């Protein structure tokens, strides 16, 4: 993966980089040291071991060591590099992580660089261990200390990362329904994309956190067939992936979806809800292909023709999640950034919640469809330590 990095001069006469090697050793020049100031101000992710492929649009792939030195010394204050690495934690010490996080928090002005470098490069399980060690050493909960030390969207990312997956989803669900309206897009995204085991844990933790059940909150915030679909999905009782492929049921479900929708006036919505909530995901993938044998429109086209509003939005999201969940998230990521500004709520939630699930597939679907990497879009839309946290959650270019 070719990453793009923008460095800025920190001292008069210096970017803060120790360059290494060159075409003398038949390799491209390589970064060997980055000043802490450069690490804080650069845009992107620059690692020790990145080969420098281009500089301000000039290909320096085949340059000797002193050739790239002259280029950088005669460049301006801001320089753009194209780089590529020359091809959890391994020595995980929760106590050392907790100590370094405390030192970063207690540094005058807060050392966000260190907080991000650690937390976004530990697994959620390791973060829980760090949090336990932190409370012991400091008598403060880690999440409270960081809530006070951080602000803006960086605070949102870091606090999201510190919750268990179930706690994070439950609080995101609660936020989508709190207040006079509903954030249907977020409610749909979570309810349509979580599996049985995730929803079972969400249902349990939601009741512990909020002293009321998710289902009652959904009923109090939604109505009509939109409510029926959300309630059914949230129960998390979809059939598990079987070993036997049920070809007779595949054909019958495809016929039933057709007979309930495009073939008749109006729609038999309970029939759509039953089939699409109860059958396993691999079964429904084959149902949707068999559906095209009977229907002139595929399942997504049929939904747009049959229903509208929240119900339509939900069926469309559900079908995408069934057909190709990594591509579903790649598209939502793209939509969160493509236009003016950023839908940060969505961008953050996906990067936090999928970083340990299927981020490799998301990045692959994203680059295949959109041509540039997810890294690249995050870099154009966000800045600062917040950008850095999302890029680490991304996990590389391409």
């Amino acid at each position: 993966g070719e990453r793009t990095v923008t460095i800025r001069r920190q001292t008069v006469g210096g970017f803060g980089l120790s360059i290494k090697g060159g075409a003398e050793h038949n390799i491209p020049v390589v970064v060997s040291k980055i000043s802490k100031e450069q690490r804080a101000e650069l845009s992107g992710l620059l690692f020790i071991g990145d080969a420098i492929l281009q500089i301000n649009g000039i290909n320096v792939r085949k340059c000797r060591h002193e050739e790239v030195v002259q280029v950088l010394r005669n460049a301006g204050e801001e320089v753009t590099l194209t780089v590529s690495f020359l091809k959890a934690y391994t020595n995980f010490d929760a106590e050392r992580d907790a100590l370094n996080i405390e030192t970063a928090i207690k540094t005058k002005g807060v050392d966000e660089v260190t907080i991000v470098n650690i937390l976004t490069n530990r697994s959620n399980e390791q973060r829980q261990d760090i949090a336990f060690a932190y409370q012991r050493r400091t008598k403060k909960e880690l999440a409270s200390a960081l809530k006070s030390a951080l602000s803006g969207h960086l605070e949102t990312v870091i606090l999201g990362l510190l919750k268990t997956p179930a706690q994070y989803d439950a609080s995101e669900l609660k936020a989508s329904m709190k207040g006079l309206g509903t954030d249907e897009d977020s409610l749909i995204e979570i309810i349509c994309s979580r599996t049985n085991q995730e929803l079972q844990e969400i249902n349990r933790v939601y009741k512990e956190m909020y002293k009321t059940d998710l289902e009652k909150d959904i009923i109090s915030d939604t109505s009509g067939d939109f409510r029926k679909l959300m309630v059914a999905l949230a129960k998390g009782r979809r059939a598990e992936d079987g070993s036997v492929i049920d070809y007779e049921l595949i054909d019958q479900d495809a016929r039933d979806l057709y007979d309930a929708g495009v073939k008749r006036k109006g729609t038999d919505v309970p029939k759509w809800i039953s089939i699409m909530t109860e059958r396993s995901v691999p079964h429904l993938q084959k149902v949707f292909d068999r559906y095209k044998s009977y229907s002139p429109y595929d399942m997504l086209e049929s939904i747009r023709k049959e229903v509208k509003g929240d119900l339509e939005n939900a069926f469309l999201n559900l079908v995408q999640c069934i057909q190709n969940k990594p591509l579903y998230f790649a598209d939502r990521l793209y939509d969160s950034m493509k236009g003016k500004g950023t839908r940060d709520k969505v961008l953050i939630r996906i990067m936090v919640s999928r970083s340990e699930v299927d981020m490799l597939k998301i990045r692959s679907e994203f680059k295949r469809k959109y041509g540039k990497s997810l890294y690249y879009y995050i870099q154009q839309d966000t800045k600062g330590d917040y950008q850095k946290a999302l890029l680490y959650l991304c996990g590389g270019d391409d």
Binding site: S18, H25, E66, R73
Partner: peptide, 10 residues
Amino acid sequence: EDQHTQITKV
């Protein structure tokens, strides 16, 4: 798998 490399601060 290589020799002693040159290092330059820029």
